[PDB]
Structure formats: structure tokens, C-alpha cells
Paper text:
As the first identified cell fate determinant, [name] transiently forms a basal crescent during mitosis, preferentially segregates to the basal GMC daughter, and then promotes its differentiation to neurons/glia by antagonizing Notch signaling. During NB division, Pon together with [name] is basally localized and is segregated into the basal daughter cell. We found that [name] [name] specifically recognizes the AB motif repeats of its adaptor Pon in a previously unrecognized manner. The multivalent interaction between [name] and Pon can lead to LLPS of the complex, forming condensed, autonomously assembled membrane-lacking compartments both in vitro and in living cells.
Several repeating motifs have been found in Pon1-228: type A “FxNxx[F/L]” motif and type B “NP[F/Y]E[V/I]xR” motif. Proper combination of both motifs dramatically increased the interaction with [name] [name], whereas the isolated one barely bound to it. For example, Pon fragments containing either B1A2, A2B2, or A3B3 showed significantly enhanced binding avidity to [name] compared with the isolated A or B motifs. To elucidate how combination of A and B motifs can strengthen Pon’s binding to [name] [name], we solved the crystal structures of [name] [name] in complex with Pon A2B2 or Pon B1A2 peptides. The complex structures revealed that either Pon A2B2 or Pon B1A2 binding led [name] to form a symmetric dimer-of-dimers in either a “head-to-head” or “tail-to-tail” organization. Pon binding could also induce [name] dimerization in solution. Despite of the distinct domain arrangement in the two complexes, the A or B motifs from B1A2 and A2B2 occupied the identical sites on [name]. For example, the bulky aromatic ring of Tyr154B2 (same as Phe120B1) inserts into a hydrophobic pocket formed by the side chains of Tyr87, Val117, and Ile139 from [name]. The side chain of Arg158B2 (same as Arg124B1) forms hydrogen bonds with the backbone carbonyl oxygen of Glu92PTB. By analyzing all the [name] or [name]/ligand structures deposited in the Protein Data Bank, we further found that the newly identified B motif-binding hydrophobic pocket on the Drosophila [name] [name] appears to be present in most of other [name] domains.
Residue numbers in the entry:
A (entry chain B), C (entry chain B): 118 to 125, 135 to 143
B (entry chain A), D (entry chain A): 72 to 112, 115 to 201
The structure:
């Protein structure tokens, strides 16, 4: 299919208080 | 950047976009939807200081402290997956009992660099 | 807080087969 | 537009962005993430015909039928919440056993108008 497109750092704080 | 956060020499030039209430304490989609609201609202240029003592934003033009966020009340932070310089964090505002997302555009760095530094601040604060 | 920003058609096909 | 869909006189001038595999059969975020992939990939200008017989896209320049989608295999359709002229639908490609999202930019209308017309096609096809 020439119209088909083929498919090709955040932090939680453990000290939240 | 880890040693810089520990030593309180870690700062990033940013445009501060403001903050907006959110209803979840974490999540990249949550942050990105908040950033969209912030962008649809003039950003203030300043310096974001990242340390175990807090995230402090100082306005370039007035030299005033416009954000002073304790690390203990920050729940989550993330780069914007759709804009390389975008960054935000979610925090608990205890006085109004709300979750708030604070949004940034990094002037000289990737949003991932800012997020990693804030993640370091999480670790340092807990260590201490 | 002067930095705070205040907050201000799809179909499923029942005949999917 | 409902009578136009029933009568096979409903067509919209579109840019067809192509299609991309997705892993859910419905959802606006699913469609918007697919549209982002399509946009990061030259759109083909044409006419999107909406009827109980299918969604047919005919290329303006070659007058050829480049999309011929039965309604029975379309699961979901939606306007793009972030771009007023954006529109997409998800369908089942039975030959490859995949869910595929087909993306559009409406040239002369809102994406909501296209979605409502395709929703009408769902109703008409089921009626018949």
C-alpha cells in the first residue's frame, strides 16, 4: 500500500510528602 | 548535572508558561494537555534553579522570585513528547488542595535535560 | 496567582462487522 | 448532510494523509497519535465520498479511486481535537488482520462535519 506510513526521561518523586 | 543539583549550581534559562490545575498527580499525557492549555493562554523569561532545596524561578527582568517550589510537594516531571524544549512538573498546592502543572520552554536545552535534573532533585531531597 | 491560567462529534459504528 | 449521505451526494474536498496501523479499534487519542505519525511522514488532494456503500477517496489529479472502504469494517471516526480541519477513522483491514487509521485534512470544512457525515453512514448502512 503506497499510502501506508510505516511506524519508525520522566520521573515520579519517591519523596512526595 | 547531578553534582550541580547537589551543589546548588544547576540552573536553566527558561520561559515560564505559568500553571494550570490538573486532576491527576502524574502522567505525560496529563502534562501535555496542561501545556496545551498554558500555550493557548506571554511567557516570562527567567532562570530555573534546580536543587534539593526547591525549584526556584527568578524573572530575568525584575530579578524577583516568581516560583518557589519545595521538592517534597512535586509529584512528577516530564519532557513534552511533542516539543523538544518543553518541560513541566506537577505539584501539590497544599493551601488550595489542588494538583497544579507548571509549564516551561527551555531556551538553551532539551526538556529531557530539565526533567533529568529535577529527577536528580527528587533523589537528593530523599537522600537528605 | 497572576501566573495561573484558568481553564475555560465522534462515532462508533454499531454495524461494525 | 444526512439526506446527502443516504442519496449518495455527500462528498468533501480533502487532503488524504495516508494510513497507519493502530492497536485499538476506537478512541480520539488513538486517532490523534496516528495523525501525528501521518503528519511526520505529501498529502494527496481528492474527494471523499461518504455513503452507505463506503468511504471512497478519488484523487483529483488522476481521477483514480485510492481508498474504497466498506462501512461495515469502519469501527470509529473522529475530528482531531487539536486541528479544526483534521479528521480520521479507524477500520479493520481483514486481509492483514490489522486496525488501520486513515487520516485527512478537510479543505473546506471542519473535521467535525466529516465525522458527522461518516456517523450518518454508520446509521444508514445498519438501517439497510
Amino acid at each position: 500500500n503506497p499510502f501506508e506510513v510505516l511506524r519508525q526521561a520522566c520521573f515520579e518523586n519517591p519523596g512526595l510528602n | 548535572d547531578e553534582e550541580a543539583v547537589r551543589s546548588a549550581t544547576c540552573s536553566f534559562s527558561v520561559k515560564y508558561l505559568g500553571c494550570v490545575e490538573v486532576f491527576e498527580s502524574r502522567g505525560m499525557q496529563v502534562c501535555e494537555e496542561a501545556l496545551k492549555v498554558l500555550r493557548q493562554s506571554r511567557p516570562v523569561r527567567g532562570l530555573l534553579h534546580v536543587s534539593g532545596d526547591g525549584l526556584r524561578v527568578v524573572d530575568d527582568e525584575t530579578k524577583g522570585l516568581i516560583v518557589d517550589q519545595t521538592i517534597e510537594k512535586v509529584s512528577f516531571c516530564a519532557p513534552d513528547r511533542n516539543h523538544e524544549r518543553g518541560f513541566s512538573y506537577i505539584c501539590r498546592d497544599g493551601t488550595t488542595r489542588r494538583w497544579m502543572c507548571h509549564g516551561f520552554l527551555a531556551c538553551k536545552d532539551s526538556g529531557e535535560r530539565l526533567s533529568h535534573a529535577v529527577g536528580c532533585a527528587f533523589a537528593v531531597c530523599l537522600e537528605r
